Write an enzyme that holds these catalytic residues in place. Structure first.
Site, short mmCIF file in Angstrom:
data_model
loop_
_atom_site.label_atom_id
_atom_site.label_comp_id
_atom_site.label_asym_id
_atom_site.label_seq_id
_atom_site.Cartn_x
_atom_site.Cartn_y
_atom_site.Cartn_z
N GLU A 87 -11.69 4.60 0.23
CA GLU A 87 -11.84 5.16 1.61
C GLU A 87 -12.33 6.64 1.58
OE1 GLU A 87 -8.83 3.93 0.26
OE2 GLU A 87 -7.19 5.26 0.84
N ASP B 244 -3.51 -3.04 -2.00
CA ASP B 244 -4.54 -2.02 -2.02
C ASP B 244 -4.51 -1.25 -3.34
OD1 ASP B 244 -6.65 -0.57 -0.90
OD2 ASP B 244 -5.37 0.98 -0.04
N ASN B 245 -5.64 -0.66 -3.71
CA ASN B 245 -5.72 0.38 -4.71
C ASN B 245 -5.48 -0.12 -6.07
OD1 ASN B 245 -4.04 2.11 -2.21
ND2 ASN B 245 -6.13 2.67 -2.83
N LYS C 242 2.33 3.58 -5.80
CA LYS C 242 1.74 2.56 -6.65
C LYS C 242 2.71 2.05 -7.72
CE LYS C 242 -1.33 3.41 -3.81
NZ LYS C 242 -1.19 2.71 -2.49
N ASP D 206 0.83 -1.19 0.00
CA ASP D 206 0.00 0.00 0.00
C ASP D 206 0.87 1.24 0.00
OD1 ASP D 206 -2.48 1.45 0.22
OD2 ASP D 206 -2.34 1.42 2.43
O1 LIG Z 1 -0.97 7.20 -2.90
C1 LIG Z 1 -1.46 6.40 -2.06
N1 LIG Z 1 -0.66 5.71 -1.24
C2 LIG Z 1 0.77 5.85 -1.14
C3 LIG Z 1 1.31 5.57 0.24
C4 LIG Z 1 2.45 6.03 0.67
C5 LIG Z 1 2.94 5.74 2.04
O2 LIG Z 1 4.01 4.80 2.01
C6 LIG Z 1 5.32 5.41 2.21
N2 LIG Z 1 6.15 4.92 1.16
C7 LIG Z 1 5.98 5.05 -0.25
N3 LIG Z 1 6.87 4.32 -0.92
C8 LIG Z 1 7.67 3.70 0.01
C9 LIG Z 1 8.74 2.84 -0.08
N4 LIG Z 1 9.32 2.34 1.03
C10 LIG Z 1 8.84 2.73 2.25
N5 LIG Z 1 7.81 3.57 2.43
C11 LIG Z 1 7.22 4.09 1.32
C12 LIG Z 1 4.98 6.91 2.08
O3 LIG Z 1 5.99 7.65 2.77
C13 LIG Z 1 3.57 7.07 2.62
O4 LIG Z 1 3.58 6.99 4.04
C14 LIG Z 1 -2.92 6.25 -2.04
C15 LIG Z 1 -3.69 7.19 -2.67
C16 LIG Z 1 -5.08 7.12 -2.64
N6 LIG Z 1 -5.88 8.06 -3.33
O5 LIG Z 1 -7.05 7.89 -3.48
O6 LIG Z 1 -5.23 9.00 -3.80
C17 LIG Z 1 -5.74 6.05 -1.96
C18 LIG Z 1 -4.94 5.16 -1.30
O7 LIG Z 1 -5.53 4.15 -0.57
C19 LIG Z 1 -3.53 5.19 -1.29
O8 LIG Z 1 -2.87 4.21 -0.66
MG LIG Z 2 -4.11 2.60 -0.10
#
Ligand SMILES: O=C(NC/C=C/[C@H]1O[C@@H](n2cnc3cncnc32)[C@H](O)[C@@H]1O)c1cc([N+](=O)[O-])cc(O)c1O
Ligand SMILES: [Mg+2]
EC number: 2.1.1.6
Length: 213
Positions: A197, A167-168, A142, A139
């Site tokens: 969500e 997810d997603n 992406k 998650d």
């Molecule tokens: O963009 C989304 N999620 C990205 C999540 C990102 C999370 O993971 C960490 N991260 C990233 N690469 C990483 C690599 N390694 C470690 N942490 C990392 C980021 O610092 C952030 O805390 C998203 C967007 C929507 N939306 O509707 O826009 C809906 C959702 O459910 C989502 O999950």
């Molecule tokens: Mg998500």
């Protein structure tokens, strides 16, 4: 003050300490009513819960902790002795996740790894005493789902029966990963349809009646 600190503070102020369900519910209330945030949410969360209960994993890896919503969700269902490892690149988010877990009373089950998954995955076996993973929750960003899945494989972290749960896969979508796993004889895939969500989005009309110059 950041949105993520605001979520944590809302939890500390309203949720019952040592009660994971209460922590989940406080996050969901805050994000439903006050500020949207990318937690998996209760609808997909319930599917997560059903999957975790089916497989009863002893060792779970999470990619992307964010505020710790999914870590609380998963860790509260782990059996005694089972572990969750969760990777988070943003130190602010890693701190928030640790405090969320502390508040929920789940700190003994979870280990937070601060760093980029591509850098940490190759260190898992030596540094964190890992053989193979029972389950992986994806998650994070992406575009990192597919490269990290290939890296998990390269590093020998997958065994026959390791469950990836992503997810997603519809919104925002993960098209390369989804095409890959669906087309690969190395994976057997199932889709669980749900809802994004926190989507009760407020908008309104303004009536403005001209009064003259
Ligand atoms: O963009 C989304 N999620 C990205 C999540 C990102 C999370 O993971 C960490 N991260 C990233 N690469 C990483 C690599 N390694 C470690 N942490 C990392 C980021 O610092 C952030 O805390 C998203 C967007 C929507 N939306 O509707 O826009 C809906 C959702 O459910 C989502 O999950
Ligand atoms: Mg998500």
């Amino acid at each position: 003050d950041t949105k993520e600190q605001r979520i944590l503070r809302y939890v500390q102020q309203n949720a019952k300490p040592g009660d994971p369900q209460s922590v989940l519910e406080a996050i969901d209330t805050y994000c439903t009513q006050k500020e949207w945030a990318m937690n998996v949410g209760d609808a997909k969360g319930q599917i997560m819960d059903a999957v975790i209960r089916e497989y009863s994993p002893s060792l779970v890896l999470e990619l992307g902790a964010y505020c710790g919503y999914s870590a609380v969700r998963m860790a509260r269902l782990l059996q005694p002795g089972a572990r969750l490892l969760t990777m988070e690149i943003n130190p602010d988010c890693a701190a928030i996740t640790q405090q969320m877990l502390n508040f929920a009373g789940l700190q003994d089950k979870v280990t937070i790894l601060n760093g980029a998954s591509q850098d940490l995955i190759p260190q898992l076996k030596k540094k964190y005493d890992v053989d193979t993973l029972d389950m992986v929750f994806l998650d994070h960003w992406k575009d990192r789902y597919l490269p990290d899945t290939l890296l998990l494989e390269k590093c020998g972290l997958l065994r026959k029966g390791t469950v990836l749960l992503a997810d997603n896969v519809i919104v925002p979508g993960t098209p390369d990963f989804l095409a890959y796993v669906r087309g690969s004889s190395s994976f057997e895939c199932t889709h669980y349809s749900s809802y994004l969500e926190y989507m009760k989005v407020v908008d309104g009309l303004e009536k403005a009646i001209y009064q003259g110059p």
